[PDB]
Amino acid sequence: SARDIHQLEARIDSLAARNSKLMETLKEARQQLLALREEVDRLGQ
Amino acid sequence: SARDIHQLEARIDSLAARNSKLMETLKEARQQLLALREEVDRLGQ
Amino acid sequence: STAAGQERREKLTEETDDLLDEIDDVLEENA
Amino acid sequence: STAAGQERREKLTEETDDLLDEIDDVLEENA
């Protein structure tokens, strides 16, 4: 119970960090997708 | 304790689903970034 | 420059726009 | 078509490559 609580909390901390990293990487992807779409429009015009 | 264990389990379930969604969306962004990089190289060729 | 080339760039940009809107949704829902 | 336009597309593709390798890292570490 004390040990279960502690291991449930550490799994939460872990997923929380993973989600944070995934979210950051996705915001970077968002920005680079937009920059490549603008270059594709410039190249095709 | 029963109620705590359940709430920690439901937060874990929640974060697990969020991670899954973020991961899926990032795999999609990966494929689209590659397709845009190939079009950039075709247009600048 | 060909019709097939223009159609390909339109398809790719349109898919990119659908993914940008979906990314923005994902990022706001995970807030 | 200009030297600046070529340098721009090279910068953009090289940044896209760095982000592709980082995405692959992130996706493998996740699993």
Side-chain angles (χ1 to χ4, degrees):
Chain A
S1 198
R3 186 172 323 194
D4 291 349
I5 284 301
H6 229 276
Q7 290 193 91
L8 282 198
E9 275 159 355
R11 152 67 112 269
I12 279 162
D13 284 355
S14 165
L15 292 168
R18 287 185 181 203
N19 175 90
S20 182
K21 181 72 181 141
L22 281 170
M23 195 162 321
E24 185 46 60
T25 306
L26 192 57
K27 278 183 219 197
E28 292 167 1
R30 155 68 152 99
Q31 296 175 31
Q32 191 63 23
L33 284 164
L34 178 66
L36 288 165
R37 193 200 72 201
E38 299 276 339
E39 176 74 4
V40 166
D41 285 343
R42 261 194 300 275
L43 287 168
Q45 92 203 357
Chain B
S1 211
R3 185 159 336 190
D4 287 343
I5 285 301
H6 209 282
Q7 290 186 88
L8 292 191
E9 275 163 341
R11 154 68 108 264
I12 278 161
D13 290 356
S14 164
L15 296 164
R18 279 144 142 239
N19 268 220
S20 188
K21 182 69 191 137
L22 282 165
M23 202 165 329
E24 188 47 57
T25 306
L26 195 55
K27 275 172 184 149
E28 298 166 4
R30 207 261 185 224
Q31 299 181 32
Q32 189 66 18
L33 285 157
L34 179 64
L36 286 163
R37 191 200 75 200
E38 298 281 335
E39 178 69 12
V40 168
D41 282 344
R42 262 194 300 275
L43 293 166
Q45 160 214 324
Chain C
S1 193
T2 56
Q6 171 209 265
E7 187 188 17
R8 181 177 63 252
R9 280 180 310 266
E10 295 184 354
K11 285 184 161 157
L12 257 176
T13 58
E14 160 59 32
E15 310 171 339
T16 301
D17 295 331
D18 287 339
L19 186 52
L20 288 170
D21 285 349
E22 184 184 336
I23 286 172
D24 291 346
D25 290 346
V26 168
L27 286 175
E28 97 177 304
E29 108 198 1
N30 205 281
Chain D
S1 184
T2 53
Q6 183 239 263
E7 184 186 19
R8 189 170 60 251
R9 272 178 324 264
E10 293 185 351
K11 291 187 161 153
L12 250 183
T13 61
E14 168 61 33
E15 298 161 4
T16 300
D17 294 333
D18 287 339
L19 184 56
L20 290 172
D21 286 347
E22 177 179 329
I23 287 171
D24 290 348
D25 287 351
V26 165
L27 285 183
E28 100 177 301
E29 99 199 6
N30 212 270

